[PDB]
Design an enzyme around this catalytic site. Sequence first.
Site, PDB file in Angstrom:
ATOM      1  N   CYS A   1      -0.596  -8.208   6.849  1.00  0.00           N
ATOM      2  CA  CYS A   1      -1.487  -7.829   6.147  1.00  0.00           C
ATOM      3  C   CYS A   1      -1.298  -5.650   7.010  1.00  0.00           C
ATOM      4  O   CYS A   1      -0.699  -5.476   7.757  1.00  0.00           O
ATOM      5  CB  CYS A   1      -2.964  -8.365   7.320  1.00  0.00           C
ATOM      6  SG  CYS A   1      -4.388  -6.742   7.067  1.00  0.00           S
TER       7      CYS A   1
ATOM      8  N   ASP B   1      -9.824   0.857  -0.442  1.00  0.00           N
ATOM      9  CA  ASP B   1      -9.447  -0.322   0.644  1.00  0.00           C
ATOM     10  C   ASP B   1      -7.837  -0.123   0.660  1.00  0.00           C
ATOM     11  O   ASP B   1      -7.299   0.446  -0.684  1.00  0.00           O
ATOM     12  CB  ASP B   1      -9.815  -1.778   1.314  1.00  0.00           C
ATOM     13  CG  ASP B   1      -9.557  -2.379   1.995  1.00  0.00           C
ATOM     14  OD1 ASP B   1      -8.991  -1.893   3.195  1.00  0.00           O
ATOM     15  OD2 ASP B   1     -10.254  -3.424   2.410  1.00  0.00           O
ATOM     16  N   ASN B   2      -6.976  -0.328   1.803  1.00  0.00           N
ATOM     17  CA  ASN B   2      -5.713  -0.646   1.315  1.00  0.00           C
ATOM     18  C   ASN B   2      -4.801   0.481   0.982  1.00  0.00           C
ATOM     19  O   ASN B   2      -3.797   0.799  -0.369  1.00  0.00           O
ATOM     20  CB  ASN B   2      -4.966  -2.263   0.536  1.00  0.00           C
ATOM     21  CG  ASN B   2      -5.633  -3.315   1.341  1.00  0.00           C
ATOM     22  OD1 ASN B   2      -6.094  -4.108   0.758  1.00  0.00           O
ATOM     23  ND2 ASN B   2      -5.568  -3.465   2.598  1.00  0.00           N
TER      24      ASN B   2
END
Lengths: 415, 415
Positions: free
Chosen positions: B76, B208-209
């Site tokens: 992750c 995100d990310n």
Amino acid sequence: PFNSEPPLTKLYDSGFLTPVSLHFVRNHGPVPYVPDENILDWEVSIEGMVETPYKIKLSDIMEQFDIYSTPVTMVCAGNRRKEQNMVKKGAGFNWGAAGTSTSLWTGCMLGDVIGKARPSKRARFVWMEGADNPANGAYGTCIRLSWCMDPERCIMIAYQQNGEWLHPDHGKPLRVVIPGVIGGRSVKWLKKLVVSDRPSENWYHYFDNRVLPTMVTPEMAKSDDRWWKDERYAIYDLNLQTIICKPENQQVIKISEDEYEIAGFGYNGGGVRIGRIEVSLDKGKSWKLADIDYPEDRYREAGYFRLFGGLVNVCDRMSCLCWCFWKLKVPLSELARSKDILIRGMDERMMVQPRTMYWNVTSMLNNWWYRVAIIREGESLRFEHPVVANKPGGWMDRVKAEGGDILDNNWGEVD
Amino acid sequence: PFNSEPPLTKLYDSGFLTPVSLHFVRNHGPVPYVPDENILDWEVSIEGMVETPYKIKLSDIMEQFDIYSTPVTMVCAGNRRKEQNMVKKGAGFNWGAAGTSTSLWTGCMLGDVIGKARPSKRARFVWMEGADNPANGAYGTCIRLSWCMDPERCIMIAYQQNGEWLHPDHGKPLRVVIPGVIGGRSVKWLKKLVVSDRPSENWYHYFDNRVLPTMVTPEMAKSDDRWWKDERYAIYDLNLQTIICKPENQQVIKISEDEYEIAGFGYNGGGVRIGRIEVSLDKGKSWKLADIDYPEDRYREAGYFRLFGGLVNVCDRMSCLCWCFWKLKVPLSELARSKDILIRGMDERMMVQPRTMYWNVTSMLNNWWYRVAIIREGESLRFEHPVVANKPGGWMDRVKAEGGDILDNNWGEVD
Ligand code: MTV
Ligand code: MTV
Ligand code: NA
Ligand code: NA
């Protein structure tokens, strides 16, 4: 061996494409001299793990293969070696920060040349061997086969540099140019391509162009050959570098309400874009985001066109095979409150340059943050780069004169 | 969202392949529940910049495409987030160091599926969209087209994990698995593949990310959307991590003449091998070389064989798509003279983990050196990891109780 490095200011000032006359030179031994009249008959043999070994003359390459013209930044593994030498003396030419040059290279794709011989499914490497004869015999090394077949990597066999036939010092009449990889793999005066299932066994493949683990001393490396036979330490893709070029070493600037444009360049290996370049005036407590210009992207955006009889097809790739330039305006009043300028880059793999020097036996790929000291003298600031090519005059010379430890948490500077 | 992280000791102790029951979970919203009886009819649409758009059911994938079984480490982007949270609180689940798990994944090659539709020469990306419906609509993102076509990257559409049909939490009945890249791009409950010339425009692709530049504050990122629309900050390939697992947090060891085997794991992005893992007991003054075991190389060396009806063809690749394990024996007497254990890796691009934390808004890809504190108590040593999943009990908790600054040159520890 012979090495020459352009002046850092001249390299920066020349812009995206370095003049052939300024391109750095690195030869392990004597240069094979090939007269103009002999160029077109120069022959390369393709052999090893292939269905159909063949030999080909340069004139035949020019007529039989698709010809490309490609901007590529070349970088010596030894760039920024003098910085390490200031910490602990070692062997090797004391490069400053200008052991890099960028050119348009014209020639064919190495993958096309190898593809024609039909490599075995078990093949993994392409060995390359030069016509030169330095102290330990012909220079040779290797590159992964899959990289030769990858259009993003654009590995070439070139016979022109900035549209000129190659000079003897740059591999006349033919060399490999391997983008995003240390100059050591870009074999000059190319004679032989051998397809293999294993790395090169050439003397120069073992005993040069490696970053040995930091705790291996020169005595350990001299006494135990095994240190040089572990592929994990062989250098291929470049690591990330950023260099300050403005202000220049010993440049003096009057403190005023004016801004000053801090500036420089960066480069990186494996075609991975540098996503951010950050500058700190407070020893890494806070960082400021620089503006990056990627001139290669202008070629990417132009689509197809020809230069020097070769297709420019940067447009077909997403990779970054060339250096970029960066700029950051800061108030002179802020610089006047600062003791140094640090710069660092982080790439699109979110890998950043380290604070800590990684000292190693060959003092290669030294990519800790580049630091320019700021000395206030009355109503002016004077700036010092870490080292000067071929002379004293940088902050590392000064720190040593002060008795300081360059590896300490404040670069050997007082408190 | 829902997140679960296995205990670090259990993750290490399980070895190279993590049990499905222990695999970390990250869902942005509710999991789409698909009954067993509906698996084989699950349909994916392939569209966009292709000559021949088509739709295909899972049963048809299983019968019409070559099936592979591949070990891949999943990671992750949020792994090691709690460490950053200790420095400055931020949004997001406080992962310890075990937001990673490694499995055999069985399915087809994404490149084969896309190749069948015949992508345009102008195409550059493959968008992926899931059947889930979190707060901002369907989860979607993208990956480079050229990476889908690269055998070294082995990007898959998987329907089994360690030979079991996928669980709902892991994408039942079908997901993309993208090796060497953050888990965020490995889209679960896959419904649509869109070939495009540009990145995804999905909400989750922007917001995100991403690793935003360090000087961008949460307030800046909230108030100016443009920070989230620059692809240079979007995470794809992982950065390099090394983690100490032995000794364990709060482990106590009697000082004796015995050696203790310090141990852990490492992983890295883009298929680039970790070439060296180094441990320091003296705050980075000297480093010791650890022994690395690469279990993936055992699969590479085995040649072709089948697992769960899928071809294992690690043997065809040189890439490292999985984590490795490391060990280093040290005398307990030396540990007793030390205040901490640091570990760092350097990869085959000679890029090393940084000393300095790179704090960022989403607190992602935190890869500064992992540190285990050593506390001497009588004739024994007690060891402290930086943070504990879900509880206090690490050296960062202690340093905060001591009033220390974790970002200082001594990790906030006294002198
Ligand atoms: N045949 C041959 N002999 C060399 O000594 C030789 N040296 C190289 C090195 S080692 Mo370094 O990673 O220590 S930078 C570098 C360059 C530089 O090319 P240039 O002189 O055209 O700049 O060519 C490489 N190719 C070579 N080819
Ligand atoms: N459809 C879909 N929805 C998600 O929320 C979603 N989250 C992902 C993230 S974001 Mo992270 O880079 O914040 S790790 C990660 C994983 C993890 O898969 P697992 O639950 O099977 O471990 O799947 C990615 N794929 C997804 N796919
Ligand atoms: Na970046
Ligand atoms: Na290495």
